[PDB]
Structure formats: C-alpha cells, structure tokens
Amino acid sequence: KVFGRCELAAAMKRHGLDNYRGYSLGNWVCAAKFESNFNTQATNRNTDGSTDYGILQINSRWWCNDGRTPGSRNLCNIPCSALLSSDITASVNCAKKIVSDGNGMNAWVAWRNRCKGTDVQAWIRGCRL
C-alpha cells in the first residue's frame, strides 16, 4: 500500500514511534518518504547482494531473513516479506530495534542525508494526530 503522509503519521504514532528514543514523529515520516515514498512494497537491492524491504527499507543483511543473503543475520526474527505488508506493525517493531542498536536513526541513510537537521515537524503539519 502507498500511505498518505498524515495516514502514515497516524499509524506510526499509534504504534509508539512518536518520540521513540527521542525521535519525534516527523523524523519517522521523513525517513519513510525518502526511503520508500510511503510504499510498503518498496524493495531495493544493495551492491553487496542484500535487499532493503518496505516502508523503512530494512536491510536483509542484519534485520530480516530473505533466504538469499548468504551469512546474514535475522535480528528482528522475521521474514523480510513481512516488512512489505499493508500493516506496518512488523516494520515498526523491527525499526524499534534498529534505532536502539546504537547509531539511532543514522542507520537510515536517507534520514541522515535528507531529514537529519531539517524541519521534520513540517512532515506532520496539518495531520490530525
């Protein structure tokens, strides 16, 4: 599914992402916009042969199992395909472990390069939260 900005904003907050580990909701929404264009079905292959999955482009090298990333970890204990669902629960729960893993939201390259330092509140503006 392709989310609306405010719609995703609401599901994200419902799922406890607002101020999770100090990151206001607009950070999460901004990362999703640039990672996936709010498309839960986004996949992208990395040069190392791992694949990024879903709304938050979660990487198969560390976080989910896709059976074709030799010698990878599945730290979120999920099939990568679960990160492609119209329900973002899987993506959120896994995102929760990623942002706790020590580098915070910097784990998301598009967040670091496109959201970090910008007015991310602009991403939840006008939304009925």
Question: Can you give the chain as a three-state secondary structure string?
Answer: CECCHHHHHHHHHHCCCCCECCECHHHHHHHHHHHHCCECCCEEECCCCCEEECCCCEECCCCCECCCCCCCCCCCCCEHHHHHCCCCHHHHHHHHHHCCCCCHHHHCHHHHHHCCCCCHHHHCCCCCC
Which of 52, 66, 87, 119 is an active site residue? 52
Other CB atoms within a 10 A radius of the CB of residue 31 amount to: 28
Is 104 exposed, middle or buried (CB count within 10 Å of its CB: 0-12, 13-18, 19+)? Answer: middle
Please tell me the number of Cα atoms within 13 Å of 65 on its side-chain side.
6
Output 32-37 pairs: Cβ under 8 A, ≥24 positions apart. Answer: 32/3, 32/8, 32/56, 33/5, 33/123, 34/110, 34/111, 34/114, 34/115, 35/108, 35/110, 35/111, 37/2
Q: Which residue has the tokens 């719609």?
A: 7
Rounded to 10 degrees, the C-alpha dihedral 71/77/82/84 comes to: -60
Is 35 catalytic? The answer is yes
In the block, residue with structure tokens 């020590």: 102
Which resolution in angstroms does this entry have? 1.5
| CA gap 1, 25 in Å, rounded | 20
Query: What CATH number is attached to the domain comprising 115?
Result: 1.10.530.10
Asked whether residue 48 is marked as a ligand-binding residue, the answer is no
Catalytic residue chosen out of the listed positions 7, 18, 35, 119? 35
Range of the domain at 60: 1-129
Q: Distance (Å, rounded) from C-alpha 33 to C-alpha 37?
A: 4
Query: Domain tally for the chain?
Result: 1
Partnered with residue 44 across adjacent β-strands are: 52
